[PDB]
Amino acid sequence: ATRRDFSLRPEDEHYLDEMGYCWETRLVGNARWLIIHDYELPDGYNHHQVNLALLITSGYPVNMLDMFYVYPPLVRVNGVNIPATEATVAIDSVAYQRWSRHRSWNPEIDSVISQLAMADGCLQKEVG
Amino acid sequence: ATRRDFSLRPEDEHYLDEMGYCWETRLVGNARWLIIHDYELPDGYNHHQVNLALLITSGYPVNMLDMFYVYPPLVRVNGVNIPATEATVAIDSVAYQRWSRHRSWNPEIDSVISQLAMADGCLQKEVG
Amino acid sequence: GNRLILTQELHTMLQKHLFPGDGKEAAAILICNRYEGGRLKLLAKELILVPYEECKSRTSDFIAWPGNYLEKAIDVAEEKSMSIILIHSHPGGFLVFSDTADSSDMQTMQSLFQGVDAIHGSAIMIHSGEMRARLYREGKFAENVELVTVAGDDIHYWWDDKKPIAFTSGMTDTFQKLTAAIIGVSGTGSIVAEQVARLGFGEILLIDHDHIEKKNLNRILNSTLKDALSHRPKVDMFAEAIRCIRGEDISRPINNTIFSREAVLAAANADVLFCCVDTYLARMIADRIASSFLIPLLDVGVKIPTHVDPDDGRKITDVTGRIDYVKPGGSTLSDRLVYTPELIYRENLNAEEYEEQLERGFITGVEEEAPSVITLNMRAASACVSEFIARCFPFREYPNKRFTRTFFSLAGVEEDYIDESSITQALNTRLAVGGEEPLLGLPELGDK
Amino acid sequence: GNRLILTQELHTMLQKHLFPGDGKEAAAILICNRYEGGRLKLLAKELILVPYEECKSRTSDFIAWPGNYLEKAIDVAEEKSMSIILIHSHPGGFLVFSDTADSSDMQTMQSLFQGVDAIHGSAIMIHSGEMRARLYREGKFAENVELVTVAGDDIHYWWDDKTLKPIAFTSGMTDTFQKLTAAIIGVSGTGSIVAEQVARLGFGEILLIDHDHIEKKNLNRILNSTLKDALSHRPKVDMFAEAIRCIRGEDISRPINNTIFSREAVLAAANADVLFCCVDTYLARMIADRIASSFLIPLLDVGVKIPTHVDPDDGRKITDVTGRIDYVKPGGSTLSDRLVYTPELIYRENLNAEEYEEQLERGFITGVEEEAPSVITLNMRAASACVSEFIARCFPFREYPNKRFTRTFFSLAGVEEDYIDESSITQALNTRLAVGGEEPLLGLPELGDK
Amino acid sequence: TWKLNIQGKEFTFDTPTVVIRDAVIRAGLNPNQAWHIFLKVEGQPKVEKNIDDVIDLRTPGIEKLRLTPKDVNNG
Ligand SMILES: Nc1ncnc2c1ncn2[C@@H]1O[C@H](COP(=O)(O)O)[C@@H](O)[C@H]1O
Ligand code: NA
Ligand code: NA
């Protein structure tokens, strides 16, 4: 929550606040991480809350956002692995699961807002 | 005769010698003058002998020779002036008459030799 | 030395309004953002046309128009304290009337200042489009605008102190009053910067983060072996070279990425941007500086792709160059696909991310090229600077707009041109916003 | 490092003779002039083909031919002590036979020295055209020829140390240039840019020839020049030689502070492997043309111009913004053939002050120069195409034969570029070709010795 | 009248054909200098012309008459 090493777009921050998220911006070296704490998940996973993180790429929002990251790593409650989620990326030493989920990026309309909407859509989808 | 400040083409000098001319090459500043002493003229002028001079242009024989020069100035014996001969050019302070006589120049074949042939042709022509 | 900058689009609309053809004065109002760096730049943003019908006393030398248009401009300008510039057809005489009071030109400028605490101004246009302007501080007459300019297909400079043919002393006199910025000072950029210096530009910004190495002694003008052995910064080397050539300290070296507040705020002061970089990311920054601060932009690139032939081995596929001219409000480098999000994305992965994600098959591999070479760099850089000359001092037998993009191949021995009117334009959200924060719309550049 | 140089015409004729298609060896004789400057240059002047029918034997690795052709060579070589180079198909085995006796390879080379007191040699060609050559001093095997070269439409370098061909722009291009000498004739607007590229491309030696000096008025154009140079009227070649020393970290340039129309400059330039002519007089272009022909040096001539004219309604305006690049190969059409200079152009350019005043007074000339001032952008656009042209010809990368680009004209005002092919150019008699330093030098009595 | 673009500018002539020399003179250019002379017609490659050639201004697609100097000698 209180950690804010850098700014997003003014519209991003307004959206994250209007959503009532506990959110931080964390610089790790030169990498800019958005981390949403205790993001609530639908039922069907080994966990019901995660940290949901976006890597804010250099040149954002003309550079695209790509994929998303969660900690702890998610598995379906029946033990089946989520497809295309086998990589991990360390954020300040904590190993996040990286979801390989890709889409076209239009700088006039895409942002953290649409990237979090994609993340939620994937999380809803992969309960089964 | 004995004055030889510069060289012509080897074929030029051979021709001038084979013709038995008394000839000099005289540098006047940067100007290169060929001067033939006591050049014999046909009858019909105020004089029967002149100095006949060529200005050896820079870059000769790729640069062309142009016109020719005589001292003393020539007039037809009846007192009529030779057409296109009114300019004078000083050579080491002596005022030579310049004959405005022009022709095409081909560096593969033209030289002092053909320019002196032109001069003689003009001198033969302008008795009348 | 200050500037009033109009886009070609607004200038064209303004001139039509002020010169409808009946030979009588008309009125309009330009609302401007400002950049207050080394010089004051006024950045034309919105235009209000006063309809002829709502005016009175419209003659060849006077016009009376209603004060509700003045209140509209104040209302547009209030939130961000924008500058308001009144514009009238040439003679320029006017008054502003309401029911209770008529107000002279001086009184109108005082009312503007009372409505918006900012510098305001009053300008006159003649029928052929040239403009003169005077600025008013705290509502009272102050100084003339040194330069009113429109970088269109042709680039126009209307100097307060006031056409020469290209390459004469009149061209040099113009360049002496201008500031050029060179972004990337290496293979093409050292050649652009050399030409700009020897053509007489009065101030030259040099922006690059990199240093000289033995490998770039085959290409970087003025560089020496000692430079390479001591890893001298490109911009510091070139600034010192300009100082010895021009005999005066007119260069401004910025040893930094263009993607920094330092470099963006310096380049914002320039009258022309020359972009000579080898990254998509820097071309995007240059594009957004150009739009935000209404600066014409020349972007140049070269490429020598290679491939492996079965019977010959490696060979040269092509030898190519590109010159792009971008005018404020015309199509952008983004519109032209000079960069895209995908290309920036792939470039700005680190080595391990790139290798790892190439294996996954979402990105594609970068293509192979031969080493850069000074002859090709010079062929492109000379045409790049000549493009600026041709737009300031037209000499071509066709409209400059036909040469908005130039592509050449030294292998195919062809050169092709693309007209501005063939390029689709997306919404340009940066246009004339100046330094609104976060700078360039990029949060990394924000002021915290 | 010495050179054996063949013209393209002589090399083609030689290769057809040595490879008729029957896989059998053949024999020919090259008679050469010499330039003995900083390097020995052997300049192929005459070729004698040994007819196959007069050979006693022609096989895949040997040939026997009659010595009467050897004596014909000696006879041609005798007057001027020309060098004689026997050439044979790739294996190279041969003997010479008379009416009554046979002589080996080495006996033949000794008899050559006996007939002509000069250096001689023996060379071998392979089917693709490449050549190797060995020199013999006093009739006895001496040193190998370091470089056999033909500057045709493509430029070929056959090095004694050969062991694939590099492609343009790579380290292999630089390796080639590192062994070459380039001469820049005129080191001013275009020439300073050509010399800059040549230095940064890695040429091994660089001759700089110019008589003029830096002034304030040319600081808008001359690369590496400074205000300090202008205030001291520094010579262009000395300024640029010292900049090369700093750039390259090595003293690889030879500044010649003189006109090209001098014995000093001609004899220095004769050592170069390539001439870049960046001059601004017709007279200087003729000197370069004759150097290239006399010493068998490829020549790239570059010119620019911004002509103006007076529009009757609007006044003066730019007519064109233009550049010209001419590639001249030894034995191909020359600058003279192309009318790059003529006698009339040279004559008109070189009138003295009283002549200029007379011309003005009589109305033969107007005293208006209908050109705009030179500009670095055009100079660079021309000079970069000029050096790229040499690269293209040493390391072909274009999609058309280099012969198509023998002349290039470009217009920045009309936005056009046109190319003229060598085959469309009429060639006159080339009396300078391969005569080297015969006196008077270049056939110009102003350059004769003493 | 018929129009002809010469060196980038349109000129009007009162005859259907013109001698190139006369068109060059009209534009203020010097016809006695050495030129590359080219006539361009739409849909056709440009055609090199001589100074005393006649051109027909009624030719469909007629674009422009253009000169490039042959004497290009500065450095
Ligand atoms: N973000 C950037 N900011 C400043 N200069 C850059 C940027 N990206 C690339 N360049 C410069 O562009 C130049 C390209 O070099 P070259 O390809 O030799 O023209 C290099 O000196 C780079 O450092
Ligand atoms: Na637009
Ligand atoms: Na020939």
Short mmCIF file of C-alpha atoms in Angstrom, two decimals, chain B residues 32-91:
data_model
loop_
_atom_site.label_atom_id
_atom_site.label_comp_id
_atom_site.label_asym_id
_atom_site.label_seq_id
_atom_site.Cartn_x
_atom_site.Cartn_y
_atom_site.Cartn_z
CA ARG B 32 55.26 31.54 -72.15
CA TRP B 33 56.05 33.18 -75.49
CA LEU B 34 57.44 31.51 -78.60
CA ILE B 35 59.07 34.18 -80.75
CA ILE B 36 60.34 33.55 -84.29
CA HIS B 37 62.81 36.29 -85.27
CA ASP B 38 62.84 37.81 -88.75
CA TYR B 39 59.98 35.79 -90.15
CA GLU B 40 59.82 36.43 -93.91
CA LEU B 41 56.56 37.72 -95.35
CA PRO B 42 55.15 37.80 -98.88
CA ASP B 43 55.28 41.18 -100.63
CA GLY B 44 52.33 43.52 -100.01
CA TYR B 45 52.84 44.79 -96.46
CA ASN B 46 54.62 47.78 -94.97
CA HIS B 47 57.31 45.34 -93.83
CA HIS B 48 58.96 42.31 -95.36
CA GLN B 49 60.12 40.66 -92.12
CA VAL B 50 58.52 40.51 -88.63
CA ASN B 51 58.87 38.76 -85.34
CA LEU B 52 56.07 36.15 -85.33
CA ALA B 53 54.99 35.14 -81.81
CA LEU B 54 52.67 32.52 -80.28
CA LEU B 55 51.37 32.59 -76.73
CA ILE B 56 51.95 29.06 -75.42
CA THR B 57 48.90 28.60 -73.20
CA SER B 58 48.86 26.82 -69.89
CA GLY B 59 48.10 23.18 -70.44
CA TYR B 60 49.33 23.23 -74.06
CA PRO B 61 48.78 21.16 -76.20
CA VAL B 62 45.50 20.13 -74.52
CA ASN B 63 44.75 23.78 -73.96
CA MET B 64 44.58 25.38 -77.38
CA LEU B 65 46.75 27.95 -79.03
CA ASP B 66 44.73 30.96 -80.18
CA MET B 67 45.59 33.86 -82.46
CA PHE B 68 49.10 35.02 -83.25
CA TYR B 69 51.14 38.16 -82.79
CA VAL B 70 53.53 40.19 -84.95
CA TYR B 71 56.03 43.03 -84.47
CA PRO B 72 56.16 45.59 -86.04
CA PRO B 73 52.42 45.91 -86.72
CA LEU B 74 51.45 45.16 -90.28
CA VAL B 75 49.40 47.25 -92.73
CA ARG B 76 48.81 46.57 -96.41
CA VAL B 77 51.31 48.54 -98.53
CA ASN B 78 48.44 50.70 -99.89
CA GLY B 79 47.72 51.78 -96.28
CA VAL B 80 44.54 49.69 -95.75
CA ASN B 81 44.37 48.03 -92.34
CA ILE B 82 44.20 44.27 -92.05
CA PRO B 83 40.76 43.25 -90.73
CA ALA B 84 40.54 42.11 -87.12
CA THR B 85 44.08 43.17 -86.16
CA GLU B 86 43.52 46.27 -84.03
CA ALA B 87 44.54 44.97 -80.60
CA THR B 88 48.10 45.10 -79.27
CA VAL B 89 49.73 43.05 -76.53
CA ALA B 90 52.99 44.03 -74.88
CA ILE B 91 55.72 41.39 -74.79
#
